[PDB]
Design a protein around this ligand. Structure first.
Ligand SMILES: CN[C@@H]1[C@@H](O)[C@@H](O[C@@H]2[C@@H](O)[C@H](O[C@H]3O[C@H]([C@@H](C)O)[C@@H](O)[C@H](O)[C@H]3N)[C@@H](N)C[C@H]2N)OC[C@]1(C)O
Ligand SMILES: CN[C@@H]1[C@@H](O)[C@@H](O[C@@H]2[C@@H](O)[C@H](O[C@H]3O[C@H]([C@@H](C)O)[C@@H](O)[C@H](O)[C@H]3N)[C@@H](N)C[C@H]2N)OC[C@]1(C)O
Ligand SMILES: CN[C@@H]1[C@@H](O)[C@@H](O[C@@H]2[C@@H](O)[C@H](O[C@H]3O[C@H]([C@@H](C)O)[C@@H](O)[C@H](O)[C@H]3N)[C@@H](N)C[C@H]2N)OC[C@]1(C)O
Ligand SMILES: [Zn+2]
Ligand SMILES: [Zn+2]
Lengths: 86, 249, 50, 112
RNA sequence: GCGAGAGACCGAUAGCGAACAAGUACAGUGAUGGAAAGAUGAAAAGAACUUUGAAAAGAGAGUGAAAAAGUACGUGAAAUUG
RNA sequence: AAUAGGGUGAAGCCAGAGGAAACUCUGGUGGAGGCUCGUAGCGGUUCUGACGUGCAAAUCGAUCGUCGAAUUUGGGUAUAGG
RNA sequence: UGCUGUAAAGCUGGGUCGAACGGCCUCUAGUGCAGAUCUUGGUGGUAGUAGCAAAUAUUCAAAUGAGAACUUUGAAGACUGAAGUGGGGAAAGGUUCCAUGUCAACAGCAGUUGGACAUGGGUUAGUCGAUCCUAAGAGAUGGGGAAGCUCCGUUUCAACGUGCUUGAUUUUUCAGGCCAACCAUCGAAAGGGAAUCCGGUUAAAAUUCCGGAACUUGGAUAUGGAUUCUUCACGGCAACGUAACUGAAUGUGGAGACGUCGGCGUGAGCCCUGGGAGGAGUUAUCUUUUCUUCUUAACAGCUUAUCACCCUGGAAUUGGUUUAUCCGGAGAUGGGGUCUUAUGGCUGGAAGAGCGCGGUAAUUUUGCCGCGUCCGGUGCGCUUACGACGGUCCUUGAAAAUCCACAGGAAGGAAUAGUUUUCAUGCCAAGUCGUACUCAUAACCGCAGCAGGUCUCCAAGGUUAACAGCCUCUAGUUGAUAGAAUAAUGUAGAUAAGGGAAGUCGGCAAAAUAGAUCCGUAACUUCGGGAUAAGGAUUGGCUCUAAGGAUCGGUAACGAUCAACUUAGAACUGGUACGGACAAGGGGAAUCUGACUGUCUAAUUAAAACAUAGCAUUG
RNA sequence: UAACGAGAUUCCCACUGUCCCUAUCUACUAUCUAGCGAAACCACAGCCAAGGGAACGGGCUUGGCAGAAUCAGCGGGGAAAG
RNA sequence: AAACUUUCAACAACGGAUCUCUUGGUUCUCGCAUCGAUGAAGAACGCAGCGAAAUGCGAUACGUAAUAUGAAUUGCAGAUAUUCGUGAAUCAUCGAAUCUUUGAACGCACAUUGCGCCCUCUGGUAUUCCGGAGGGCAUGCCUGUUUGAGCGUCGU
């Protein structure tokens, strides 16, 4: 009865959604995400899993602020406004 | 091999004691001024069953010397103590059943229970049902009392250590056979997970030093040195002798 | 279940929204490649995993 | 015969999910959910139920007037009449005996 | 990481896993695992209209240099089949 | 949270009889037990039955064990790879 | 289509096709395939073959439609048979819900149908949950380890309140007085817990909407009542009663708050039943007849009780008393009272609602009117709640939030005057999230619409010990490719002359027994058992008879009225049948072995294995 | 060693298709049809006897022989498949 | 002899090889130094006249301002939108802003859209009770301020 009959008794979730990475890897009883290590301060990662670093790294999201650092650096980190040409 | 059951007990995971239904720790009052210099009077409110314990306990109420407040105490009830009885504790307490006295104030042959090993530790000796401590003699110059413990050992204790006059109630439990595996099941259901017990010779060699073989047998001496390490101490640890005891001791 | 949390119900609403066929006017645009929605989900075939 | 269903989401026969089968003016047989029974107020010395005290669920005692919660006597809603009587006699007899011990002891010291 | 220029390199089973809504679809409780899939035509001009059929479609017609290019679309081998 | 209907008939209690006495006997009452027959339940003996590219990566039929406790079971919780 | 070369190969004719490519001299390499149970993709024979056979079963007609074994309607025949194939939920899913349209793919035949496809619609709360509490447990913090990721500690070697109450002051300042044992926080949609019912309403929501009627908590505050010259009420011998009827710190008590079994009592719902008032059915004959309607919520008032308690009184000729033998000079029996309101009764809610008949307007939204909706009986019935008892354990069967009460006597209170919202009435407010649907032989998990798995509530008539089996009502289905035949061999199920284990490793399999009443019952035994030992007899139908009660009324040993099914006996009777289906032990004499009940190799071993009580040894 | 046992074993009574020795009956298959429609396996294939031969051949040598297309069954062989 | 089987050729299938390309990959070289409590990287959920994704963005949501530039956008629709012009389209440029719920993530808590406290304003006859708007309350450490503690200790 360890195969099909036992597989019918799966209705209690071990993991739920993680607030940090949103992945359904937050272990309910341990209160820890098996993916990002939440609620530890540092993000979970390992050098033996390079492909896991690809899935969630800088550039896989929006980069809503780093997107513009290179353009701001080019202009010398200007402060002020553009001056109309007369 | 594998970690044996002996070794697994110490991690305290499934082997912790079952304490939900217990009625509080059984202790004497803390040594305070009243018990050091005089006596204090309390009243027995209840005599109750403590699951996992063969001896009943007595809930005893005392006034607080220093503020307007009642104090409840959890004592081990001696046989003959009753609800509504006054209990006197201190250096000047009279020699009556249930009173708590220092051992120096009790003459030779006094029967006493829940006896302190060190002054003020609130009771260590003679605490189970039907057991007691006998006062053998006094050494007034050294302030030491010699007592006889339930096992037969003789011990010198400070004369300021306290004890409770009488015999712990509930004596005679072991005279009636259990008759059933189920009675043992109910017994340990409120103590800890130590029952049933599989025999080491019924296991495989991974499980236990006694396991394996084409017959069930130990194969080496079951008397194990005191200096053996964990995983080796199964059997009769540091036995001075073995076999049926004949004659006297 | 009927008894559900806000976070779960919020996830369910989004899944319903994305479970729609392609609007037809998309296929008429210049250099359009999409001919159907390749990310359809049916409740009994593939589960949401929430 | 008409059969009934629970009116709440709890499907189990727990201590707080008890029902009563009642017939409505619509002619229908419905289950109604029954609150847990109340216990008597009990004496603080002997543990017996106190007469004259309403039997209510403890949050409901804040809704009634004082007369349903007490008795016009010392220790009214706390101790029963027999333990109050026993407390009075004991107080009197012991305090009289303290004077007797006091006077007796001075006799012990005056003559010795 | 950011910005550039190159090659006796690979040429869609190759080259990064991914030339495409690719770390996507999908699987696993989870850590993780992880594809397939490029090309009508210069231009949709993507076949009006008639007719048979319930319809899908077919037959005429039409567009086009080509329909032996009809969105099952460049060429269109072999196994296998009429 | 759950567990038809029977059988047997432990202590305790009432009444009667016998006897010189010590004592003995009888009829009721009562309703004990990891007691018993037997449903639901839980289990899984045998046919070495069916099936054996299955309804099914362990199932189906009959026959069986047990069925008030060391009973059955939901949920919560703890123990983690020598 | 031919030509050249021994060959690897090279060239050429014809067809197809649409954008680049070749000879020669050299350079260079990811440079030549038949194999590697090679890799990826594609395709065959097998083969229109195996097969699409569990779960009793379908049929006629009409409608629709191009098309109907499979859709809809009508008419039948069936089944689940209340332990459901019925009505709901928890987990899980997530729109599958509903209406409209639609059939390419999917529903292993079909399809006009669908949990499919497309477009829209749909989930309404102070009272139901969550939210709060604590449980096993998890876990921050001064800290102590560890190179460190972090580990340990939570009754934590700590100067640990983002305190509380007043007399007021507004000066947004003060001033005092009480204390700080405990308490970061998380942990239950089944534990604990403030408060809602009925009727109606949608295509799809309802204890959430509409109509009506209530309740709880928090706050504000007016009026009346109550209280005060004896300042903080009276009455009762008492148990205690009431519309109210000051009470700080502090202390204490109660509720929350708890196992299990046994019989007994009461109530409710259901079941059964008489009369009457309607309606339906049957009618060759009959049935004062067969079926059906006659109902009453939360909440408010008065009242209502086992137990318990109080007053009186003073007991052996001991009495009272339970199905169960316990109680009485520590005060019984007797007499009289008090209290809890579980539960029932009457009234309000409330007949205005619902239900049953009858009529009428009308292509109608939605109806409108009339009448009735009444009075009883019964119980070892069934289920469920409660009560008073009794048994049981080397087992004695959560915690906290929260609410109340008491003790205490601080403070403040009178006279032409202070209270208190624990007396009545009046006013204001109650946030956030969930709420559709499935809950399974198709909405969950098993790759799937899989004969597996997956927690729980309600429960009608007959037969019966029975919630078993068998038949039926309400409700729900009629789903599982179909047609024609009926060889062999199968699978499932039957029967068989004479013999009766000769079969076979072995009685495997099957047969035989079986309910109930009466009779009868050995060895052995731990005296409890063995035991249903073994083994005999009986059993239907019909017509009778006897026994076993309740309430009234004064040798009442009686008369009257009423009532439940148990038991026993008799006559008559039949193709000798009769626990007539259903349901339901085969038994005996021994040996080996483990004492027993119990447990394990999920998916080849259930055992003599493990455990066990008992015994012994060791620290 | 009483009691208990889906434990192993012998005998006996009852019982019977286990057997002498088989027969007959029913439903569902198989069968034939409409629709639907897989897989295992496959060097090439497929009639025998002897010989020799990797010492037991479908093929080779020598003989016997040898006629399309096929259906239901079957378990000798394919030292059949897994 | 047919059917059937087998061989070849033609056409039609099945299937996606070959050939030809290529906004991709791969490798080498050259130049540059710029993430975050002033809240990053990442996550969730939303935002368009008609959008599921990808791309962009944040309730000012396929974007606002500014500077430049100079007539589009386009699949369809459409102006109270524009053309010798403060003017169509423009991540062209970019220095000003907006930036939901989160996240090192900071009042506490988090399987909850759960629970406080402080200040200002404001609604309900309100210092308390109920509602709304804006602004705040994490930890370790440093410098300084203020208020304190200890017979640790000086002096009066
Ligand atoms: C219509 N079906 C779609 C279609 O987009 C399909 O495209 C193929 C296309 O890739 C082929 O075209 C091909 O052309 C060459 C050559 C071998 O033909 C290939 O190497 C190349 O991969 C591919 N572009 C074209 N010949 C047929 C379409 N159905 O590819 C995906 C699909 C789902 O099957
Ligand atoms: C007696 N010597 C053994 C030695 O044999 C060895 O044991 C390995 C054990 O470590 C392996 O196990 C190892 O790998 C497995 C897995 C990933 O394969 C892990 O689950 C495991 O944590 C890891 N230790 C196990 N697979 C085989 C044993 N013989 O490891 C050392 C040892 C325990 O001392
Ligand atoms: C020599 N220095 C010692 C220093 O070691 C320490 O003593 C502790 C003492 O405080 C502890 O004791 C303390 O802590 C325990 C806690 C551990 O449970 C508490 O229960 C106890 O009440 C408390 N006194 C004691 N158990 C061990 C000593 N070494 O504090 C006292 C000291 C003198 O400074
Ligand atoms: Zn995470
Ligand atoms: Zn009392």
């Amino acid at each position: 009865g360890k195969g099909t009959p036992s597989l019918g008794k799966r209705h209690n979730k071990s993991h739920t959604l993680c607030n940090r990475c949103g992945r359904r890897s937050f272990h309910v009883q341990k209160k820890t995400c098996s993916s990002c290590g939440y609620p530890a301060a540092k993000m979970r990662s390992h050098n033996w899993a390079l492909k896991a670093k690809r899935r969630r790294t800088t550039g896989t999201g929006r980069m809503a602020y780093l997107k513009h650092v290179t353009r701001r650096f080019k202009n010398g980190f200007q402060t002020g406004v553009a001056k109309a040409q007369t | 091999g594998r970690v044996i059951r002996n070794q697994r007990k110490g991690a305290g995971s499934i082997f912790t004691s079952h304490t939900r239904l217990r009625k509080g720790a059984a202790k004497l009052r803390t040594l305070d001024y009243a018990e050091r210099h005089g006596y204090i009077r309390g009243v027995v409110k209840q005599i109750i069953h403590d699951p996992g314990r063969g001896a009943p306990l007595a809930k005893v109420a005392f006034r607080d010397p220093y503020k307007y407040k009642l104090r409840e105490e959890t004592f081990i009830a001696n046989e003959g103590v009753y609800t509504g009885q006054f209990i006197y504790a201190g250096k000047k307490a009279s020699l009556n059943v249930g009173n708590i006295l220092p051992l120096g104030a009790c003459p030779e042959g006094t029967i006493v229970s829940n006896v302190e090993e060190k002054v003020g530790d609130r009771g260590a000796l003679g605490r189970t049902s039907g057991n007691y401590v006998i006062i053998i003699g006094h050494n007034p110059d050294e302030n030491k009392t010699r007592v006889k413990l339930p096992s037969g050992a003789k011990k010198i204790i400070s004369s300021d250590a306290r004890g409770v006059i009488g015999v712990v109630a509930g004596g005679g439990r072991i005279d009636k056979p259990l008759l059933k595996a189920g009675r043992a099941f109910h017994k340990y259901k409120v103590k800890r997970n130590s029952w049933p017990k599989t025999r080491g010779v019924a296991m495989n060699p991974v499980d236990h030093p006694h396991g394996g073989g084409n017959h069930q047998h130990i194969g080496k001496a079951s008397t194990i040195s005191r200096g053996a390490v964990s995983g080796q101490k199964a059997g009769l640890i540091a036995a001075r002798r073995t076999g049926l005891l004949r004659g006297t001791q | 279940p009927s008894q559900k949390s806000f976070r779960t119900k919020q996830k369910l609403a989004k899944a319903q929204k994305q479970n729609r066929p392609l609007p037809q006017w998309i296929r008429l645009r210049t250099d359009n490649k999409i001919r159907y929605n390749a990310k359809r989900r049916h409740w009994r075939r593939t589960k949401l995993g929430i | 015969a008409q059969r009934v269903t629970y009116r709440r989401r709890n499907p189990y026969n727990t201590r707080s999910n008890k029902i009563k089968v009642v017939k409505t003016p619509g002619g229908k047989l419905v289950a109604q959910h029954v609150k847990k029974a109340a216990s008597r107020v009990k004496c603080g010395d002997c543990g017996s139920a106190l007469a004259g005290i309403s039997t209510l669920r403890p949050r409901q005692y804040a809704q009634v007037s004082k007369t349903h919660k007490t008795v016009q006597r010392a220790y009214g809603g706390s101790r029963c009449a027999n333990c109050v009587k026993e407390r009075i006699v004991r107080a009197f007899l012991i305090e009289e005996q303290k004077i007797v011990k006091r006077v007796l002891k001075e006799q012990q010291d005056k003559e010795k």
